[PDB]
Design a protein around this ligand. Structure first.
Ligand SMILES: Nc1ncnc2c1ncn2[C@@H]1O[C@H](COP(=O)(O)OP(=O)(O)OP(=O)(O)O)[C@@H](O)[C@H]1O
Ligand SMILES: Nc1nc2c(ncn2[C@@H]2O[C@H](COP(=O)(O)OP(=O)(O)O)[C@@H](O)[C@H]2O)c(=O)[nH]1
Ligand SMILES: [Mg+2]
Ligand SMILES: [Mg+2]
Ligand SMILES: [Mg+2]
Ligand SMILES: [Mg+2]
Lengths: 132, 101, 352, 80, 51, 26, 208
């Protein structure tokens, strides 16, 4: 239909999200074909989806059609937030792009689950140590 | 010329179980159902118990084929954990390497 | 008073009252609504010391049909469906207020899900040995029903003789209030009392004695599944419950002289997914067939006109104590977080 | 039986049994002796109702289909 | 828990695919499993475990 | 409670041997 | 930490980046120029730029979390704030016009002030001298004062004295008493002060 949009990918833990952000919109967000308030019943998850637009004062101005797979509820929310923020940079000034970068909205989170080691209860949790 | 008497006994158990496997399966089939009369099942129970003791597959013990170690055996290679490491650490096992991740 | 309107009569509400809250008198609140109000809305009424209800479009469309009903024609079943928390129950409550003011007989079911789950005392019915009785659920509803329709209890009189025990029985021609009072006093016969009331009201409605409104909220629980179990932990079908069986008869459009208004509710439903709100998805094959034909009515989230007035009403009562709430930027965050959902907005604003 | 049927058919269905009875009561309320099955079920209003109910069963349920069902029903019950 | 049409259609399918036709409980179905697979001893792993 | 029905006790016809034996070739 | 030392903590402040260039000082301009060449950590999920964000409330919510159940931890927090506001509204309507002026209905103002009233000004550090431990009074750092206020509030709510009482009810009840300089949490601060004042002659043991 000739409408302007940008597409970008976001990654968080084991969750991968691809977000399509339209230049002009009414503020609707579709996640896997479902409205965002239904896909993320947790309030905190909807807080993250508001972070990219609210930081640049662009609430209710773009339509987002994003699909996310894998991970948990919060990992999906974090994955979408990164994907939307990267695509949102195509419709804002360069100075605001740097502001988003300095706010941590354009950095892929490298924190992933640490593996368990033999001889230990967990990644760092050791077995109970008896002196005698 | 096996590793020890315990390995030799296991070979005798495996050989006897293979010979009696067909006969034991047929008799055991009469017992694991509710169709045949209980009289016929009781006869089958005595018949299968009359088979030689070593013919039972439950008496077969998986042992290392190199050192006859009872436990710590990898079933894929049929080697004990100590013997498996000796071959693996020298690069003599194809595609097996130390795991770091 | 931007979000308020001076017209408290539901019969005069029109498209010019859309998005405006009208106050409901405490006398009506104790009488028209002794039950069926949402648990969170009751807290709002108690905190604000007043009951204000927004005049939304779905309620008006249903009120328009009621003002043009043909009592000669059989009763028409109206189904209120919509996403979770969109305001289906309060739309049904607004409809009930209109019928109560027009001297209609109110047959209000607060939530049909309460009758198919968590029944500590499940007793076999004496009238029918193949059914079960719910003395706790039946007796509670009789007290609510008696308060709502206290005026019509004496005017309405039974047309048959009903036997309760070897010693006690209700004679023909006695007022209907005796049957309701018997169920309240005799909790054992409470389940049978409700069936008698449903049988009498449905029968006499077609005689033109009174206008009967059948208001069932969460109607999808009628033709679904129950968590109740027998002594041998066997599942119990909903039709095996006498209380449910009597209510199924009322829903069929085999009687005239009134209207049937029902509202779906996924909240509290049994064996239903959270994101299910459509009629056939919740009712199922059996539920949809029983109600067929019927007139669905959609309930959606707040439009910008409705949402803005909802914020103003909260600010009018000073409910939004946060300093950033009245600001335009603060309003934008509320709109985005809730997506203009009535329940989400109320819950989010309940701690701001 | 109808339960074994994997394709919904409006003929001899519970929908047909219910709408036909409702129309008869409406005719009785109008004191009209026209109670012919062929004439009542042969009109276009029934055909639109049949299409909507069948679409609800065979196809997927959504907002558009429910609204189409609502509009067709209001024509039958003379609700405006 | 099936109708007459479903029960006979399912029974017809079993005849076509060679499955069990007569009604058989879980215990007696082991006889089918016993002869559908080689015994534990007859497997090449067992009798040829050692060189 | 024992459920026995007339059709549940009907032996399935051996259509392979009789009806569709000609299909084993070509 | 999977973050290299070159990474810097992100700054979540809308008004910080909207400040005009003219108002910036020479050093403040240098900071903005420098951050354009520094790696920035990804913003944590807890912190946001929403105008409703309260760092103290999020910090208190985390301390109530058990086994990573933040959904339940935040649910208890929002219910407590709702309960406090509802309780104040009931008292406001039941109070006369003169009394209504002094009644606070903002849950955040009550919550912030209640924690402030519980902060101890001085603490106690057991010092090992002469083969014995003495509770030597010490000044407390600013972070320690606020942490003790939250921990004391949570510990009292989790005490076994309360029976069959929900956490939002217990937390709301204690917050009001703290806001009115009453309750056990405030009494805990006074008891700490009394012990510190009673052992004031031992304040010379500390070597810092
Ligand atoms: N017309 C209205 N006027 C005022 N408040 C409303 C209105 N509709 C909804 N609300 C607010 O939204 C809340 C939820 O509304 P309601 O209980 O009617 O929704 P529902 O769609 O029936 O929900 P559910 O799916 O839980 O059954 C109410 O408690 C109230 O705070
Ligand atoms: N206890 C009692 N209940 C009755 C009596 N007559 C009717 N009822 C109740 O009235 C309701 C309506 O009964 P009805 O529909 O006529 O029974 P049905 O003919 O089997 O469907 C039932 O749920 C009964 O519990 C009576 O004589 N005694
Ligand atoms: Mg652990
Ligand atoms: Mg030797
Ligand atoms: Mg063994
Ligand atoms: Mg509801």
């Amino acid at each position: 239909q000739g409408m302007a949009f940008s597409k970008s990918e976001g990654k968080r833990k084991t969750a991968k999200a691809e977000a399509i952000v339209y230049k002009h919109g009414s503020g609707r967000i579709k996640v896997n074909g479902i409205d965002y308030q239904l896909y993320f019943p947790i309030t905190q998850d909807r807080e993250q989806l508001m972070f990219p637009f609210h930081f640049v004062d662009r609430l209710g101005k773009h339509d987002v059609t994003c699909t996310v797979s894998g991970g948990g509820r919060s990992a999906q929310a974090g994955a979408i937030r990164l994907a939307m923020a990267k695509a949102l940079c195509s419709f804002v000034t360069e100075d605001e792009v740097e502001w988003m970068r300095q706010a941590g909205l354009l950095t892929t989170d490298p924190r992933v689950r640490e593996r368990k080691k033999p001889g230990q209860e967990g990644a760092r949790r050791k077995f109970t140590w008896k002196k005698r | 010329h096996y590793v020890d008497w315990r390995m030799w006994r296991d070979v005798k158990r495996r050989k006897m179980a293979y010979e009696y496997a067909d006969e034991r399966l047929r008799i055991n089939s009469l017992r694991k159902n509710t169709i045949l009369p209980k009289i016929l099942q009781d006869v089958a129970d005595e018949e299968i118990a009359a088979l030689p003791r070593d013919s039972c597959p439950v008496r077969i013990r998986n042992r290392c084929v190199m050192t006859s170690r009872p436990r710590g055996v990898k079933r894929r290679w049929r080697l004990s954990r100590i013997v498996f490491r000796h071959l693996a650490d020298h690069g003599q096992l194809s595609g097996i390497q130390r795991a770091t991740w | 008073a931007i979000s308020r309107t001076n017209e408290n009569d539901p019969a005069k509400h029109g498209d010019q009252h859309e998005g405006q809250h009208y106050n409901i008198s405490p006398q009506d609140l104790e009488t028209v609504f002794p039950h069926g109000l949402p648990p969170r809305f009751v807290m709002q009424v108690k905190t604000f010391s007043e009951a204000c209800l927004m005049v939304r479009k779905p309620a008006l469309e249903l009120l328009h049909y009621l003002k043009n009903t043909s009592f000669a024609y059989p009763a028409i079943r109206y189904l209120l469906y919509g996403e979770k928390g969109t305001g289906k129950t309060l739309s049904l409550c607004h409809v009930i207020h209109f019928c109560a003011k027009q001297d209609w007989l109110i047959l209000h079911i607060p939530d049909a899900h309460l009758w198919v789950k968590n029944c500590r005392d499940l007793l076999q019915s004496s009238y029918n040995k193949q059914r079960f009785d719910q003395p706790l659920e039946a007796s509670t509803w009789l007290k609510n029903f008696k308060t709502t329709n206290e005026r019509f209890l004496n005017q309405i009189k039974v047309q048959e003789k009903y036997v309760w025990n070897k010693r006690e029985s209700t004679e023909k021609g006695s007022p209907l209030g005796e049957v309701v009072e018997q169920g309240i006093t005799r909790v054992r016969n409470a389940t049978d009392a409700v069936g008698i009331v449903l049988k009498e009201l449905k029968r006499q409605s077609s005689l033109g004695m009174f206008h009967l409104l059948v208001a069932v909220d969460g109607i999808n629980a009628l033709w679904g599944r129950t968590t109740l179990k027998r002594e041998d932990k066997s599942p119990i079908a909903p039709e095996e419950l006498a209380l449910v069986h009597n209510l199924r008869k009322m829903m069929k459009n085999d009687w005239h002289g009134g209207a049937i208004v029902s509202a779906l509710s996924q909240t509290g439903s049994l064996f239903k997914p959270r994101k299910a709100y459509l009629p056939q998805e919740l009712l199922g094959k059996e539920g949809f067939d029983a109600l067929d034909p019927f007139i669905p009515i959609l309930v959606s989230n707040y439009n910008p006109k409705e949402f803005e007035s909802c914020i103003q009403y909260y600010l009018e009562n000073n409910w939004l104590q946060h300093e950033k709430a009245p600001t335009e930027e603060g309003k934008k965050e509320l709109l985005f977080l809730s997506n203009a959902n009535p329940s989400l907005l109320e819950r989010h604003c309940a701690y701001l | 039986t109808e339960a074994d049927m994997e394709e919904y058919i409006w003929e001899n269905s519970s929908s047909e049994r219910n709408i036909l009875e409702t129309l008869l009561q409406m005719k009785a309320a109008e004191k009209n002796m026209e109670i012919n099955k062929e004439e009542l079920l042969g009109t276009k209003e029934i055909e639109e109702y049949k299409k909507s109910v069948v679409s609800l069963k065979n196809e997927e349920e959504n907002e558009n289909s429910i609204s189409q069902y609502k509009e067709s029903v209001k024509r039958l019950l003379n609700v405006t | 828990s099936l109708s007459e049409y479903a029960f006979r259609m399912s029974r017809l399918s079993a005849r076509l695919f060679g499955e069990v036709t007569r009604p058989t409980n879980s215990k007696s179905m082991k006889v089918v499993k016993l002869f559908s697979e080689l015994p534990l001893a007859k497997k090449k792993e067992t009798y040829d475990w050692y060189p | 409670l024992q459920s026995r029905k007339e059709y549940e006790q009907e032996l399935s016809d051996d259509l392979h041997v009789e009806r569709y034996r000609q299909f084993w070739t070509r | 930490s999977r973050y290299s030392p070159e990474f810097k903590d992100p700054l979540i402040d809308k008004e910080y980046y909207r400040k005009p260039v003219e108002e910036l000082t020479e050093e403040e301009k240098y900071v903005r120029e420098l951050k354009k060449t520094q790696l920035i950590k990804a913003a944590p999920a807890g912190k946001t730029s929403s105008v409703f964000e309260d760092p103290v409330i999020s910090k208190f919510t985390n301390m109530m979390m058990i086994g990573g159940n933040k959904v339940l931890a935040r649910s208890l927090m929002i219910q407590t704030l709702e309960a406090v506001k509802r309780k104040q509204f009931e008292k406001y309507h039941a109070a006369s016009a003169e009394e209504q002026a002094t009644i606070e209905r903002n849950p955040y103002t009550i919550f912030h002030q209640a924690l402030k009233n519980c902060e101890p000004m001085i603490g106690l550090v057991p010092i090992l001298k002469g083969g014995r431990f003495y509770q030597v009074p010490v000044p407390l750092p600013d972070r320690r004062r606020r942490f003790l206020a939250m921990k004391w509030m949570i510990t009292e709510c989790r005490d076994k004295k309360h029976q069959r009482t929900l956490m939002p009810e217990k937390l709301s009840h204690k917050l009001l008493e703290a806001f009115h300089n009453q309750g056990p949490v405030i009494k805990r601060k006074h008891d700490l002060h009394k012990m510190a004042e009673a052992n004031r002659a031992l304040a010379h043991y500390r070597w810092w």
